[PDB]
Design a protein around this ligand. Structure first.
Ligand SMILES: Nc1nc2c(ncn2[C@@H]2O[C@H](COP(=O)(O)OP(=O)(O)O)[C@@H](O)[C@H]2O)c(=O)[nH]1
Ligand SMILES: [Mn+2]
Ligand SMILES: [Mn+2]
Length: 588
């Protein structure tokens, strides 16, 4: 195997040996994260048929990977929180007894890596200069994982040195579950029909088995950055959240940092890479998925734990998201389940042009106005370095983070929810987030329903407790947005996208005590007067509709919120109950 590994960390070496004895690889390979390693691994993946090297004229050092159509997303049905007691997973999570789960996976892992290299992948979440850098080591039988982890994390040498010879780290175990018999020819994308993605909150351990795709296998992405980190955050006094981190810059050259939690398909990526439509406003981004937030000597400071973008390809283009496009155009990018063009480039639905022929994500011939399937997979991916993004804010690699002025919650609601609402205080802010709905209407609290590492009720308690024990003057203000409200004809009342900068302007003004809003049953909501609609080609009546708080619609909302808070169960905080009662009192 390998006892020529660049580390004297005994606890790690013990663990690597123990795992290797169980899974039985051919060899063990510690990854360093160097450019050379990366090149060597891609070449091996090209030779295996897993990667196709894209035309070097068009893209620099970029690759297309096609997965088995069986292994194509996060599978929440097989994703588990195995805490000691079932209550500490809670009703939003799938639980199994820790002993029962260890019995199942230790059986599955026995001999699972026969005829494969076991890669040991050290990595760091957050910038490397931290007091407590949150480090991890992922073991995997998949080069795709290594290569992807290189981009999505600070991977290898640096992280391994930051670990020392003792010093804690997250033990993340992964295997594709497709062992080889001697002489047997492998497949391009090895996976299995048996899948498990398991989190051990108390020991900070992730065990994944069966998939090689995305957040099932890139264990930093969702398993570490939210599921373990939310448990870490609970115990340590901070927040691990499904939030973009936006830096908005006024015409006066003042920087306002925002954290915003939307469920996927509700607009994180677009807001994070906003191009303001008001003169003299510009925006930079620090992240479009995960925010790790802690109190400093005063306010709340956000960092992006990740080192890369794992973006959805379909729908991405020069009109929609030019900044995403430019990030990718610099190359160094692995595309997964997109289409291959006749000139050896990548294409996906939404992208510029109408290529008449393509080779689709299953390797088959695709044809314009004939082939009934999408050329690119509808959830296909691009994996690109953060540092290639032209609008990346300079503070991105600062371990101190950035002070958050505002936290935003929202989702897709055709009715009921106004364009923007400010919370009354913190506890109402927690309640707004806690009852976040999107479309019949699914509650996705803080956009964390699939990602909580512990009881949802205790998570809300945690959110309240941080406020209670802080200077309310220095806490961020909370806001609830809704880009997707619709009129009687069914069109969007608000055009959104870049024009959402106008809602953000109002949020900024409110922070500078320089704009107003009417007190309402659900919090403070602006009139059409209070928004910068200067230069906007929309009906004022449509904007008033968007900002309407109809008492009748909100009364019909109360039983949906009721059911939801009953579903949260016995750990529902009394703080959240009071806010439900208060909202009721105010609506009558
Ligand atoms: N109407 C409207 N649609 C939006 C807005 N922002 C994003 N979208 C759409 O919502 C979908 C999801 O956008 P995306 O930014 O990828 O959401 P994410 O999955 O959270 O990153 C896409 O189909 C977008 O075109 C908006 O402000 N208004
Ligand atoms: Mn997401
Ligand atoms: Mn996104």
């Amino acid at each position: 195997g390998l006892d020529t590994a660049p580390t004297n960390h005994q606890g790690l070496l013990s663990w690597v040996e123990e795992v290797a004895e169980l899974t039985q690889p051919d060899r063990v390979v510690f990854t360093d994260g160097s450019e050379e390693e990366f090149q060597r691994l891609c070449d091996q993946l090209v030779e295996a048929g897993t990667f196709i090297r894209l035309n070097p004229e068009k893209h620099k050092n970029s690759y297309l990977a096609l997965s088995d159509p069986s292994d194509v997303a996060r599978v929440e049905s097989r994703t588990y929180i195995c805490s000691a007691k079932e209550i500490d997973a809670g009703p939003t999570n799938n639980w199994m007894d820790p002993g029962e789960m260890r019995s199942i996976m230790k059986d599955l892992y026995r001999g699972c890596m026969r005829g494969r290299t076991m890669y040991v992948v050290p990595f760091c979440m957050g910038p490397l200069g931290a007091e407590d850098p949150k480090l991890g080591v992922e073991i995997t039988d998949s080069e795709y994982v290594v290569v992807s982890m290189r981009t999505m994390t600070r991977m290898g040498k640096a992280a391994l040195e930051k670990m020392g010879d003792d010093g804690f780290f997250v033990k993340a175990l992964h295997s594709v579950g497709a062992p080889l018999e001697p002489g047997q020819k492998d497949v391009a994308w090895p996976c299995s029909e048996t899948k498990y993605i398991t989190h051990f909150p108390e020991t900070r351990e992730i065990w994944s088995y069966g998939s090689g795709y995305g957040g099932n296998a890139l264990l930093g992405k969702k398993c570490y950055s939210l599921r373990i980190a939310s448990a870490m955050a609970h115990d340590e006094g901070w927040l691990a959240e499904h939030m973009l981190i936006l830096k908005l810059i006024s015409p006066e050259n003042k920087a306002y940092y925002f954290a915003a939690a939307f469920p996927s398909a509700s607009g994180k990526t677009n807001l994070a890479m906003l191009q303001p439509t008001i003169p003299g406003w510009r925006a930079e981004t620090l992240g479009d998925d995960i925010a790790w937030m802690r109190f400093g000597k005063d306010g709340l400071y956000a960092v992006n734990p990740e080192f890369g973008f794992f973006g959805v390809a379909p729908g991405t283009n020069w009109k929609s998201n030019p900044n995403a496009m430019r990030t990718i155009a610099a190359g160094n990018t692995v595309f997964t389940n997109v289409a291959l063009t006749d000139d050896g480039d990548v294409w996906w639905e939404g992208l510029e042009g109408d290529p008449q022929h393509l080779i689709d994500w299953k390797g088959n011939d695709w044809y314009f106005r004939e082939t009934e399937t999408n050329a690119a997979h509808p959830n296909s991916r691009y994996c690109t370095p953060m540092s290639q993004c032209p609008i990346l804010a300079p503070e991105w690699d600062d371990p101190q983070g950035v002070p958050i002025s505002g936290i935003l919650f929202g989702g897709r609601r055709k009715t009921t929810v106004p364009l923007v609402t400010e919370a009354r205080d913190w506890q109402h802010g927690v309640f707004i987030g806690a009852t976040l709905g999107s479309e019949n209407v699914r509650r996705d609290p803080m956009a964390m329903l699939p990602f909580l590492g512990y009881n949802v009720g205790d998570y809300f308690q945690h959110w309240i407790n941080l406020g209670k024990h802080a200077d309310e003057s220095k806490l961020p203000k909370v806001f609830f947005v809704n880009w997707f409200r619709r009129g009687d004809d069914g069109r969007f009342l608000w055009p959104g996208f870049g024009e959402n900068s106008r809602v953000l302007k109002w949020i900024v003004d409110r922070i500078e005590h320089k704009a107003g809003g009417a007190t309402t049953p659900i919090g403070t909501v602006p009139a059409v007067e209070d928004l910068d609609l200067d230069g906007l080609d929309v009906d004022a009546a449509d904007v008033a509709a968007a900002l309407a708080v109809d008492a009748d619609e909100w009364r019909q909302e109360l039983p949906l919120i009721e059911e939801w808070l009953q579903f949260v169960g016995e750990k529902l905080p009394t703080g959240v109950k009071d806010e439900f009662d208060a909202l009721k009192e105010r609506l009558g």
